[PDB]
């Protein structure tokens, strides 16, 4: 998250070239952040405050995915298929 | 590639030449992996505000170097394992 791969993620998950805040981009960014924080917590199992931040990110991503699936179910399926298949 | 400032307090018995040799070898271990060294300043011998390892004076060095966190940590552990340097401090000015 030195903004390099963040911009990369924004551009390769954007719906249109100017898109930077749509639910797809938000879910992609949140998933990358959840992965990074999961690794950090695996290193530091005792970081309860960061784990709470991780849970907040998880819930936010869940609500965004719920909105996406409520609007366009096939788009939701494609997005989650790209993003870890929702296991 | 962040930038750090290391202040080094070297045993006062050092009288030139070997201080430069130590600085050269530590800058070498910095520069072995893309770690540029911006500046090295030798304040010289100064009286310590309090005794450090039974020594009333010390040689002061300031090293401004841009490098990786792993490289700066490895330089710090080298300075720690060295027996010829009284103290080290590694500042990272967040702005400059």
């Amino acid at each position: 998250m030195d903004a390099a791969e963040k911009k990369k993620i924004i551009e390769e998950y954007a719906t249109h070239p100017g898109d930077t805040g749509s639910p797809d981009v938000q879910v992609a960014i949140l998933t990358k952040r959840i992965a990074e924080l999961t690794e950090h917590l695996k290193v530091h199992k005792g970081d309860h405050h960061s784990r709470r931040g991780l849970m907040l990110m998880v819930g936010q991503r869940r609500r965004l995915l719920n909105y996406i699936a409520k609007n366009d179910i096939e788009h939701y399926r494609e997005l989650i298929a790209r993003l870890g298949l929702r296991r | 590639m962040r930038k750090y400032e290391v202040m080094i307090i070297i045993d006062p018995t050092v009288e030139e030449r070997q201080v430069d040799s130590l600085m050269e070898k530590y800058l070498k271990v910095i520069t072995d992996e893309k770690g540029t060294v911006d500046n090295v300043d030798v304040w010289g011998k100064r009286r310590l505000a309090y005794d450090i390892q039974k020594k009333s004076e010390g040689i002061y060095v300031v090293v401004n170097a841009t490098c990786e966190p792993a490289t700066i940590q490895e330089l710090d552990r080298l300075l720690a394992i060295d027996e010829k340097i009284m103290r080290t401090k590694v500042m990272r000015p967040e702005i400059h």
């Binding site: - | 505000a49 300031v62 103290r87």
Partner: protein, 67 residues
């Protein structure tokens, strides 16, 4: 109160720079309180951190003791 103690500005703190740290250290060797040093909260915090660093790094005494 404390407004009569006019706010003082210092610029860069630079724990190496002993002049400012001496100006803000007490005659006994302690860190002066904010209401007597006339610094903003951020400047006072930076001055205190710099004083602690200089103390640990031998540029300043932990306590000047006898005057």
């Amino acid at each position: 109160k404390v407004v009569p103690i006019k706010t003082v500005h210092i610029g860069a703190v630079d724990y190496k720079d002993t002049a400012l740290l001496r100006k803000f250290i007490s005659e006994r060797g302690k860190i002066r309180a904010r209401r007597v040093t006339g610094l903003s909260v951020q400047d006072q915090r930076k001055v205190a951190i710099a004083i602690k660093n200089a103390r640990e790094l031998a540029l300043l005494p932990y306590a000047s003791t006898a005057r």
